[PDB]
Amino acid sequence: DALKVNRAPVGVEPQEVHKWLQSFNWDFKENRTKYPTKYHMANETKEQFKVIAKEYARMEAAKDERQFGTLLDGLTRLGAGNKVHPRWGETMKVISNFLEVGEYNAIAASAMLWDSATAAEQKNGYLAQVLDEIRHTHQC
Amino acid sequence: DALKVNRAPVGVEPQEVHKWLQSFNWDFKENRTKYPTKYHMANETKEQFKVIAKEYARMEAAKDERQFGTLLDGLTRLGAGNKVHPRWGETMKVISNFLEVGEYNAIAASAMLWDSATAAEQKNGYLAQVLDEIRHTHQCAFINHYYSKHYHDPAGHNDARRTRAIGPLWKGMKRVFADGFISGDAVECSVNLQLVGEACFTNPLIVAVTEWASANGDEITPTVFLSVETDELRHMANGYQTVVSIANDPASAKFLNTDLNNAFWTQQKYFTPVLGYLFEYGSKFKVEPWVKTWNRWVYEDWGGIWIGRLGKYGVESPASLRDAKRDAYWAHHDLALAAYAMWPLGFARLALPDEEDQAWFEANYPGWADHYGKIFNEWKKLGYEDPKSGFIPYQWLLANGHDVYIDRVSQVPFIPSLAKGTGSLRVHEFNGKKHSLTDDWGERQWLIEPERYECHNVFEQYEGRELSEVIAEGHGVRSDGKTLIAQPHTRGDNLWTLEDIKRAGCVFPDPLAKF
Amino acid sequence: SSAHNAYNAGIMQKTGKAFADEFFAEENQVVHESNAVVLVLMKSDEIDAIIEDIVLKGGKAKNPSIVVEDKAGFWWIKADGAIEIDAAEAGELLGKPFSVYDLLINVSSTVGRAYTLGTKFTITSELMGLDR
Amino acid sequence: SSAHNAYNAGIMQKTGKAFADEFFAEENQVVHESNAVVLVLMKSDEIDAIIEDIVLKGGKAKNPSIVVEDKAGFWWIKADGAIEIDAAEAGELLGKPFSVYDLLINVSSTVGRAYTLGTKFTITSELMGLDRALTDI
Amino acid sequence: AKREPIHDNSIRTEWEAKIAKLTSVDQATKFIQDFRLAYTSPFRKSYDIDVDYQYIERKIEEKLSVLKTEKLPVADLITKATTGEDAAAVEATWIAKIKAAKSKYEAERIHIEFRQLYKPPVLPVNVFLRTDAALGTVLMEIRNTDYYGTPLEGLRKERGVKVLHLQA
Amino acid sequence: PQSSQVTKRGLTDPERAAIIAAAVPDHALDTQRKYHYFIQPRWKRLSEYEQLSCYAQPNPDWIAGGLDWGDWTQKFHGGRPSWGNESTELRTTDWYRHRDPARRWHHPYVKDKSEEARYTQRFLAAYSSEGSIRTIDPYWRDEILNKYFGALLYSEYGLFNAHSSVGRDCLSDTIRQTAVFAALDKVDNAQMIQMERLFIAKLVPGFDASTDVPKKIWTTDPIYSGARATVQEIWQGVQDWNEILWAGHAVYDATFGQFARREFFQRLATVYGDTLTPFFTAQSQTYFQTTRGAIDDLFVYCLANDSEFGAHNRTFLNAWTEHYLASSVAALKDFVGLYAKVEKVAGATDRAGVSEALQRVFGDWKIDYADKIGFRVDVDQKVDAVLAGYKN
Amino acid sequence: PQSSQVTKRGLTDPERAAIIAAAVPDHALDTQRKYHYFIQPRWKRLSEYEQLSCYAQPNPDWIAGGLDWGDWTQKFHGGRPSWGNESTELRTTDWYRHRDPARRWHHPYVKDKSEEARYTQRFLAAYSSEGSIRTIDPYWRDEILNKYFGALLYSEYGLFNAHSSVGRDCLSDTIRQTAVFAALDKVDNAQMIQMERLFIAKLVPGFDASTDVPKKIWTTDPIYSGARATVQEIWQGVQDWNEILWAGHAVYDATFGQFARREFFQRLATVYGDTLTPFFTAQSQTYFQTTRGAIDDLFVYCLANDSEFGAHNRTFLNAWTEHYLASSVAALKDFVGLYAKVEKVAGATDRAGVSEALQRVFGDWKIDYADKIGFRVDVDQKVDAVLAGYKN
Ligand SMILES: [Fe+3]
Ligand SMILES: [Fe+3]
Ligand SMILES: [Fe+3]
C-alpha cells in the first residue's frame, strides 16, 4: 500500500525483457514479407544470443571505446600508422575499402532477412545484425 | 501560455551553472576553516578552469576510456608488458608506488585547501583536485597492477603497500610528498603542495620520466602518467590564485618567502637524489643527464617562469637554491651508494652500471669514475651479485668507516665520508635522545620544531637485529617464502634467498652510539 | 626568436667540465625571471593534428618564438609570452565535436599561467591578479 | 588425443608436391564431416587471463582434445565436441563485473553452433534443432 | 642493544597486561596522562619504550574509551574531560595560556603539554581538535616570526642541545 | 610448442622492423590526408560523420548522385536492380544530400544509447530502494498504465518493423543510417515499455506484466482500432521507402504517437502521482526529437526543396499527408475514448484540457511538418474531429 | 631538426628492442600475479576495486589496521599526527575494513556520472524541443519550485562542504573515497537544481533563475530555519569525521533531505503536472541510495559490529542520533509549513497525505539506520511532532 513495499534493489535484465519479444508480433492478413522468395516454410525460431536495444548498444560501445582508445591514443603515440611495410599498407587500401562495400551491402541483406523473418525474435536478431553491418562499414 | 512556447533546442552549458556557484555560500559565524593557519587574508578568487560535477566526470571518463583502451586492448595484444628493460621495469615498482602515496596524500592536502578556502569557486576548484588525486592514486596502482599481470617479475610490483615498509628510502618518501603536504598550515599547502610540488617537481617526476620509460621499452607508464598530468593544469592554477591573495596582503606576504624556501628544500632534499638515482641507475638507456633534466625543469623553467616572474612581487629566489644545485649534480650518485649497499631492504632488483653506463657517467659527471665507479667495480669483484659470496656492501661500508646516517628531519640517508652532494653531519643530544641532522635547513627546522620531527629511523627500529630476520618479518620474499624480492642483479638465475642473506651475518648497529 | 626557447638551449649545449663550470657559476645560484611559457601536449591523433596544422602554422606565424620538440610520448612547446589554442579551430580541423574541455584531455602540463576563456586555451607569462 | 586439432595437422604438415598430391587426391574433393569446433578469441587483458586460467586448465581438464595456438593478434582454439566458457568464472578471475555479454566483447569468431545460456558461453559441434537429444534428463 | 620484532614483542605484551587491569575512568585517566607525560613528545621523561609507545598509547586510549562508554553518562562524553573538568573551560584556559606566552619556547611547551594532558579520550574529540587548532595557530605565528633571524649556533643554545658532533 | 608458426610482429621484431624501416619512403607520397576530401560538406568543414558515411553506397551514375558507372553485377530474377529508381515515387538530383543534424554514425549512436542503458538500471535499483512506487495512484497504475501503456508498445513495435523494407530499399548511406537508427529507437521504446511493466511487477504483488492484456487491447479494443489500422498499413501495406518514413515518423508518430506518449501517458503520470513513467517517456521523447531532426532534413531540406523536383515531391508528400493525416485523426478519435476511463482532473482530462492537448499536437505538427511542405491544415477542424470521440 | 635527441623507443627501435630482448629472462621470476594478493577480500573473490584502493593509505601499526611502523616523518606544530586516533571518537580493530558495496574506485565513478552528464544535455535539448513545460502548473513552477526547490540547493551545498574536513581527517582509503564521492554527489545536486532553474528560465519569459530569492529563503525563511541550523552545525560545528558522515547522511539527509527531495519536490511534481523536475530528482535520489550503501557499510557492518568496539561505537552513534534526530525533526517541523502555500491535493498535501509521507520517511529511517545501531524510536511520536508544524 502507501507505507509498505519491498525496497530490495532490483532492475530488469536484458533476458527478462527478451522473454516477451516473441509476443510483440500480432496477426493480420498482410503480415508477410514483401520480397520474392521460394522459401515458405514455418520459421518460428528462437534467437541464440538474447539481446535488446539497450544491451546491444552497451556491448558495442564497450567494444568501440577499447578499439578507439588503442587507435587514437596508444598506436598514434607509437607512430604505428607508418610502421607498415609499403606493400601491406597498399594492400589495406583494397582490403578495407572492398570489405566496406561487403559490409554496406550486408546491411541491406540483413534488412531483407529482417523483412522475411516471421518470428519477432528473428526480426529482433536481424535488426541487431543490420546495426552491426553499419558498424563494420564505419570500421572499414 | 499552454499553447505557445519557444521550442528551440537548448540545454545548459557548464559555465552557465558555474556562473552561480559563488552565490552558493552563505554567511554565518562559524563559517571558517577548522585547520590552523597563519594566513588570514582576503581570498575571494575566481576559478581559471570552470568545471561542474557533471562536466568534471565527462572529461575524466573520456581520458580514462582512451587510456584503458590502450592498456587493456592494444598494448596487451602487443605483449608490451614484458618488452621493458629489466632495470626499468624494476624502477617502475618504486616510481609508481612511491608516487601513489604522493597522490594519496595530495587527496588529503587538497581537502585541507578546500576546507581553508573561503570562496565557493575555490572550494569547487579544490574538490575537483581532491577527485583528481584519487584518480591518480588508482592510476599509479593500475600501473603496478598491470605490471603484476604482464611483466616477467611481478614480485614487488604486486605488494609494495607492505614491502615498502622494510626499507629506508620509503621513510623519506612519506615526508617529501606526504607528511610535508598534510601536516602543517593548511593555507600554506598552496605554497608547498602546489607552487612547489605540482608546479615544479611533478613535471620531471611524471612527465619527463615518460621519455625514460619509452627509451627503455615501457609504453604502459607514458599512457598513464601523461594522462595523470593533464589534471595538474587545474591544480597549479588553484594554488596560484591563493598565492596571489597572499602576495596582495602585506600581513600574509611576510610569511610567504620563508614557507616557500622550506617547501622547496623539503621537497628537493628527497626528490633530487632519489629521482636522479632511479632515472640514471634504474635505466639501461639514458635520455639525458639528470642534472640537465633538473636544470631545464627546476632551475630554469620553474625557477624562471614561476619564481623569477613572481620576484616582481617580492617573492625571493629560495635561499637554499645553491645548496640544491649541488645536490642536483652529485646527490643522486651519493644516494646510489646507499641504495646499492642496502639493496636487501628494498623491493626492486638492481643492476650495477655496466661498462657503457660507466663511460656515460664519467663523460657527464667527470670525477664519477674515480669515486663511485671504483666502488661499484670493487663491490662487483667482491661478489655483489653472487648469492654464494656472503657479501653485502653495507657491512663493507662500516668496516671502512663509511657510516650511514639518517636525517631526523628528511629521512634521507647520508654517508658523510663518501658524499659529494650538500651535507655535513650535526649530532645533538636533547633530553637523552641523539639526533643526526645533515644540512643547515633541516637543522633549523628541527631546532625550532622538535615535536614535528620525531620519526623513528631503520637503525632505531632494527637495532641489533640480523638482516634476513627483518626482511622475513616484513614479507620481503617471493611466493616461495625464501627468495628475496630484492636482488643485486636483474638476471633470471642465481637469485638470493634469506639463507644467502643470513650467511653474510649483517646486523644493524646504532650509528650514533659513537657520539 | 627562437633558439633561446630550445630544450637544449644555453648551458644545456655544454657537457662535462664546461657544463659544471656554468652550472656552479655564482650568477646562476639565483633564479632568473623568464618571459617564456612551456606547454606539454600528450601525443594522440587529435593533438598531433593540432600541432601540425595549428601550433606550427597559425601559432608560429603569430608567435615566431615558438619551439616544438619531440619527446617520444609528448610534444614539448616553449614560447615567449603566451601560447593559445582555439578548440573551435581544432574542431574544424578534426571534424568532430571538440569543446575547450575536450582539448584539455591531452594537455599534459603547463609552466606558466593557464586558463580557458570561451573556446580558447591560453598559457601566459602574465601574472594575472598581480600584473595590471 | 589432440594432435588432430592442431592448426597444422595432417595435410598442413606437407609442402610442395607432397601437399599438392594430397590436396588434389580424389577423396579430398568432397568435404568430410568433422566433430570439431573452432573458437577465436581476440587477445586482450581479459582474454589472456581466461586462456591461461580457464581454457588451458579446467577447460583442457574437462576436454583434453583442446588445442590453443598463438596467432599473434588472436588465440585460435580447436576442440572435439564443444568449448565452453563461464563468464561467472571469468569475473571471479578478473575481479570486476563480467556478464556473458562482456565476455563476447573479445569473442572474435566461431566455427560451430554458438550460443549463450545464463552466464555460460558455448560453441558446440551439435546441430541444435536437427540433432535429436540422447537422454530425457 | 637488540630490538625485538616490530609488531609483537615483550614490551607491548607486558604493557597490554598492565592496561587490562584498569577498571575505572579515574584510574585510566591518571594512567594515560602519566604515560603521555612520561613517554611522549620531545619533553618526555624517558625514551626506554621509544619504538613501542605509540602502539601502547593506542591501547591505553582504547581501554579508557570503552571504560568511558560503560561508566559515564552520555552528557559527560560530550561536555566533560575525564578529569571531571568542563571541556569548554579546559579550552578557554589553554587558549588563554598560549596567547599569554612570551616566547616560542613558552608557547611550544604549552601546546605539547596540552596534548600530553588532554589528547582524546581525555578531552572530547570535537573540543580537543578545535583547541589544538587554535593553539597550533598561535605557535605557528610566533615561530614563523623572523624564522631565519637566529643563527644555528644561537638556536642550538636556545634549544639547549648538547652538541655531540659538528662535521668539518 | 604449437603446430604453427609463432608469427613475428613487424612492429616490434627487430629484424622485420628494420626491413620495414628500410622499405618505407623518407617522405609522404601525397599531402592530401583528408579521408574522402571530395565529399561536399554540409557545414563549414567536413565532419567525421560525413567522411565515414558518404558514398559508402556504390551507386552508379543512373541513380541520381552516384559516382560509379554501368549496370549491377547481379540483379533479381526478372531484372529488378540491386538498388533502383523504381523503389520510390520521389525524385532528387542527388540521393546523397541527406545529413543527420545529430551527425550520428554507428559509434556516437551506440555510445549515447549505452549511457541510457546503464543509467536506467542504476535508476531502477535506486528507485526500488527508495520505495517511491508507494505514492502512485493504484487505479492509474493497474487499469490505465499497465493495460494501455502496455498496449502502446505494439504501436512502437509495428513502426519498428515498417523500417525493414526501408533498410533494404533506400538509396543512400546517410538515409539508410537515419532509417536504421530510427528503427532501433522504436523497438527500444517497445522494449522499454515492457521493461517498466516488468519492473512494477517486482514491486507490486499481483501486478501482472504479461503482454496478454496489452496485446488483447491493441488487437481488439476500439481505443486502438484506428492506430493499429494505420500502423499495419504503414508497415505492411506499402513499399515506397519514402512513403513509409514520411507516414511513419512525420505523420502518424508525430500526431498519434506524440499525443499518446507525451500528452497522455507522460503528462497524466504527473497528474496521478506516477514518479516512474516519466523516466521512461523521457527516453522515447528524446528519441522522437532526434529522429525528427533527421526526418526533417530528408523530406524538407532535401526532398521538398530539391532544386529540380521539389514541387514534384511535394505533390506526393501532400497526397500521402492527406491520407495518413486522415488515418491519424481517426486513430486519435478512437484513442481519446480512453479519457472516459480516467479520474477527471480539471485542465487535463476534461474537454477543455484534452482540447488544448490536441491543439498542441496539431498546432506543433502544422509548424514542424505541414507548413514546410505547403500542406494546408485547419488546426481547429482537426481538433474538433478528434473531440467528436471524447465522451463528455 | 630539434635541439634535443629524438629518443628511440625500446619497444619499436630494432637495436634497443634487441638489447632489451637479450636482457629479459626466458621465464617469470614469481608466479604471484595478483596485485596486492594479501588484501583480505570482503567478497568471494578479491575485486579490482579492493586491489586499487586498499592500503593506499600508509598507516602505521598504531592506527588500527596499518601495516607500517614508526612515527610520521613530519607532524603539525604541537605534535598533531598526520593521521591519528584523536580524529574521531569511534574505534575499530581495522580502519581498512570498510567496502563500498558499489565498489567505486575513481574510474567506474566518473564513468557513471559522465553518462548522466551527457544524457542530461540530450534530454534537455529534446524537452525544450517538445514544449512539455507548457502543461506545468504556473504557481507551482513560479512560487514553490523556483523559490523553495532553489533554496534546497543550499542544503545540498552545505552537506557537500561538510565533507572537506572528512576528506582530510579520515583514517582509511576506502573511507576517503566513499566520503569524496558522496561530497561530489552533494555538490552535483546543488548544481543540478540550479541547472533546472536556468533551463526553465530559457523557456518561460519572466522566470528568474537568479539564486537571490532562493538564498534569501534559505537564510531567512522560517521554513528552512531548522534545516539551515542543522547543516551549519554538521558542516562547521564539529570535526569528528565519523560524526559528520553519520549526522550528515544517516540522520539529517536520510530524514529531512529525503522528505524534501522525494516527498515534497519529486512527489508533488507528479501531482502539479511538472514533467521536468522528476528528471532531476531521479539523479539526486539515485545518488542518495548509492551513498547510503557505503555509509551503511561504514557505520553498520564495520563500526556498529566491530568485534571489540561495536557496543562502544553504538554508544556514541546513539548519542549523535539522539541529538541530530531532534535537529532534523525540528527542521521538518519548520519545513512542513510550506504545505500552507501549495494547492490542496487529497492524499498528497492534506494532513493525511503529509502524515503518510512522514510515516514513510521516519519508518524507512527506522528500518535502514535506527534498528541497525540499536536506536529506539517511536515513529508515530516523530510524525506527530512534525505535524505540529502543519497548518490545517
Ligand atoms: Fe559485417
Ligand atoms: Fe596528482
Ligand atoms: Fe595534483
XYZ file of C-alpha atoms in Angstrom, chain B residues 1-12 16-17 20-21 23-26 28 30-32 34-36 52-54 56-58 60-61 64-65 68 78 80 82-86 100-101 104-105 107-108 111-112 114-115 120 123-124 127 130-132 134-135 137-138 141-142 144-145 147-155 157-162 164-165 170-171 174-175 179-180 182-184 211 214-217 219 285 287 349 409 411 449 451-458 461-462 478-479 490-492 495, chain G residues 5 7-11 16 19-20 23-25 27-39 48 50-58 67-83 105-107 109-111 113-114 116-118 120-121 124-125 128-131 133-134 153-154 157-158 160-169 172-173 176-177 180-181 183-184 187-188 190-192 194-195 198-199 202-203 209-212 215 218-219 228 231-232 234-236 238-239 244 283 287:
248
model
C 0.901 30.008 -22.102
C -0.448 26.458 -22.527
C -0.154 26.501 -26.332
C 2.766 28.799 -27.195
C 6.384 28.270 -26.151
C 9.799 28.635 -27.719
C 10.668 25.118 -28.905
C 14.242 25.868 -29.961
C 16.577 23.077 -28.732
C 18.535 24.299 -25.714
C 20.448 22.757 -22.857
C 22.582 24.309 -20.104
C 26.177 28.760 -17.244
C 25.871 26.870 -13.961
C 26.155 30.988 -9.988
C 28.435 28.894 -7.733
C 26.414 32.643 -4.585
C 26.080 29.091 -3.157
C 27.894 30.076 0.039
C 26.104 31.987 2.799
C 27.307 32.528 9.325
C 31.174 29.520 12.334
C 31.797 29.521 8.565
C 35.599 29.403 8.673
C 38.853 24.199 11.023
C 42.608 23.944 10.423
C 45.422 26.025 11.953
C 30.906 21.480 -12.504
C 30.394 17.946 -11.255
C 28.789 16.628 -14.445
C 34.282 17.016 -14.340
C 33.168 13.423 -14.792
C 32.684 13.688 -18.548
C 37.936 12.372 -16.792
C 35.950 9.422 -18.126
C 40.173 7.047 -18.916
C 38.473 5.253 -21.818
C 42.384 1.770 -20.618
C 51.465 -6.417 -28.421
C 54.144 -4.751 -24.337
C 57.198 -7.706 -20.991
C 59.046 -5.599 -23.624
C 60.558 -3.434 -20.846
C 64.251 -3.468 -19.995
C 64.552 -5.281 -16.625
C 50.987 6.672 -5.414
C 51.454 7.749 -1.789
C 47.139 9.707 -1.939
C 48.377 12.383 0.473
C 43.876 13.988 -1.720
C 44.109 14.947 1.946
C 40.772 18.689 1.223
C 42.660 20.996 3.600
C 39.121 23.001 0.245
C 38.441 23.426 3.960
C 32.706 28.901 -3.245
C 36.102 25.262 -2.775
C 34.666 23.992 -6.046
C 37.042 19.459 -4.787
C 40.622 16.111 -4.462
C 38.911 13.846 -7.003
C 41.903 14.038 -9.379
C 42.014 9.938 -6.136
C 42.172 9.247 -9.885
C 46.153 7.065 -6.744
C 44.243 4.459 -8.759
C 48.050 1.456 -8.614
C 46.903 0.418 -12.067
C 51.820 -1.840 -10.858
C 48.621 -3.887 -11.190
C 52.986 -4.953 -14.449
C 51.938 -7.621 -11.928
C 49.941 -9.262 -14.723
C 52.253 -8.956 -17.737
C 55.871 -8.332 -16.686
C 58.426 -11.069 -16.049
C 58.840 -10.150 -12.341
C 55.544 -9.411 -10.543
C 57.116 -9.582 -7.045
C 55.001 -4.764 -8.255
C 52.402 -6.890 -6.508
C 52.839 -5.952 -2.846
C 54.672 -2.647 -2.336
C 51.984 -1.269 0.011
C 53.515 -3.551 2.622
C 57.957 -0.677 1.086
C 57.865 -0.516 4.910
C 60.427 4.802 1.832
C 60.738 6.916 5.016
C 56.489 9.760 3.387
C 57.862 13.231 4.061
C 53.579 14.427 5.657
C 55.167 17.594 4.234
C 49.326 17.468 5.024
C 50.903 18.156 8.444
C 51.099 21.915 8.789
C 60.616 9.586 -22.057
C 59.862 4.881 -23.672
C 63.607 4.659 -24.201
C 63.599 1.501 -22.076
C 60.629 -0.082 -23.820
C 54.796 2.242 -23.145
C 69.141 3.731 -21.957
C 67.625 10.181 -22.117
C 66.154 -5.771 -8.431
C 64.009 15.604 9.502
C 64.934 10.689 6.486
C 60.139 22.499 15.800
C 57.942 17.952 18.212
C 57.190 17.899 14.464
C 60.194 15.667 13.732
C 60.162 12.504 15.886
C 60.312 9.955 13.060
C 61.930 6.641 14.014
C 64.619 5.511 11.602
C 65.512 1.991 10.464
C 63.820 0.047 14.893
C 66.151 -2.728 13.665
C 58.571 -14.091 -3.269
C 55.746 -16.616 -3.136
C 68.493 -8.306 -12.939
C 69.178 -11.778 -14.349
C 66.760 -14.698 -14.117
C 68.528 -15.235 -7.140
C 67.746 13.978 -29.118
C 64.683 9.354 -28.234
C 64.456 5.917 -29.839
C 61.641 3.781 -28.373
C 62.792 0.485 -26.904
C 59.513 -1.133 -27.954
C 67.088 -1.225 -28.425
C 69.148 -5.310 -26.401
C 66.009 -5.492 -24.250
C 68.220 -8.863 -21.066
C 64.687 -10.132 -20.315
C 64.705 -13.651 -18.762
C 60.849 -17.283 -17.520
C 58.852 -15.423 -14.896
C 60.602 -14.740 -11.581
C 57.461 -15.312 -9.455
C 54.034 -16.803 -10.090
C 52.065 -14.449 -7.824
C 50.430 -12.115 -10.344
C 47.505 -10.936 -8.189
C 48.180 -7.287 -7.352
C 48.201 -6.933 -3.535
C 47.139 -10.571 -3.159
C 47.338 -10.211 0.648
C 44.268 -7.983 0.961
C 39.813 -4.760 -8.692
C 39.914 -3.537 -3.479
C 43.238 -4.063 -5.298
C 43.429 -0.455 -6.437
C 42.188 1.087 -3.174
C 43.161 -0.995 -0.143
C 46.251 0.008 1.876
C 46.976 3.031 -0.313
C 46.788 4.905 2.979
C 50.205 4.396 4.685
C 50.845 -2.316 8.138
C 53.641 0.230 8.573
C 55.623 1.169 11.691
C 57.136 4.198 13.348
C 56.106 7.790 13.782
C 55.146 10.121 10.952
C 58.064 11.962 9.394
C 56.537 15.409 9.904
C 53.701 16.367 12.234
C 51.742 19.565 12.882
C 53.198 22.249 15.091
C 52.344 20.983 18.562
C 52.530 17.318 17.605
C 49.198 16.507 15.932
C 49.972 13.452 13.774
C 49.444 13.327 10.020
C 46.616 10.898 10.747
C 37.086 3.495 -7.476
C 37.577 6.690 -9.458
C 37.008 5.187 -12.918
C 32.525 6.577 -10.548
C 33.245 9.157 -13.259
C 32.196 6.715 -15.987
C 28.387 10.279 -13.839
C 29.623 11.019 -17.360
C 24.334 11.191 -16.654
C 26.098 14.403 -17.761
C 25.727 13.697 -21.477
C 21.044 15.136 -19.313
C 22.002 17.589 -22.071
C 17.116 18.995 -22.136
C 17.586 19.682 -25.859
C 12.841 22.175 -24.919
C 12.012 20.921 -28.441
C 8.961 19.066 -27.090
C 7.466 22.126 -25.377
C 6.824 22.750 -19.979
C 3.523 24.127 -21.331
C 20.334 23.699 -3.211
C 21.855 25.420 -0.156
C 25.722 22.707 -0.798
C 26.288 22.776 2.977
C 28.876 18.959 0.342
C 31.204 21.248 2.269
C 30.757 19.227 5.485
C 32.989 16.643 3.766
C 36.033 18.927 3.454
C 37.469 18.127 6.898
C 36.405 14.478 6.477
C 38.460 14.259 3.282
C 41.461 15.418 5.281
C 40.920 13.615 8.588
C 41.451 4.787 5.545
C 41.457 4.742 1.754
C 38.137 8.567 1.975
C 36.824 7.501 -1.444
C 34.721 12.291 -1.514
C 32.302 10.610 -3.958
C 30.674 15.106 -1.483
C 30.789 15.448 -5.268
C 27.547 19.498 -4.857
C 26.185 17.919 -8.048
C 23.061 21.743 -5.851
C 24.383 22.395 -9.350
C 21.644 20.262 -10.901
C 20.436 25.476 -10.393
C 20.695 23.860 -13.834
C 18.486 28.072 -15.531
C 16.771 25.763 -18.014
C 15.117 29.762 -21.160
C 11.539 28.519 -21.768
C 16.867 31.800 -12.256
C 18.997 34.074 -10.083
C 19.857 32.458 -6.757
C 18.881 35.719 -4.991
C 19.227 32.317 -0.915
C 17.347 29.636 2.767
C 18.875 32.255 5.050
C 19.914 25.580 7.882
C 23.563 21.949 8.167
C 25.615 24.735 9.713
C 27.127 19.369 10.773
C 29.406 21.256 8.394
C 31.162 23.746 10.643
C 32.187 19.601 14.644
C 35.293 17.942 13.256
C 29.985 14.368 10.261
C 19.576 11.786 -10.197
C 22.956 9.301 -5.576
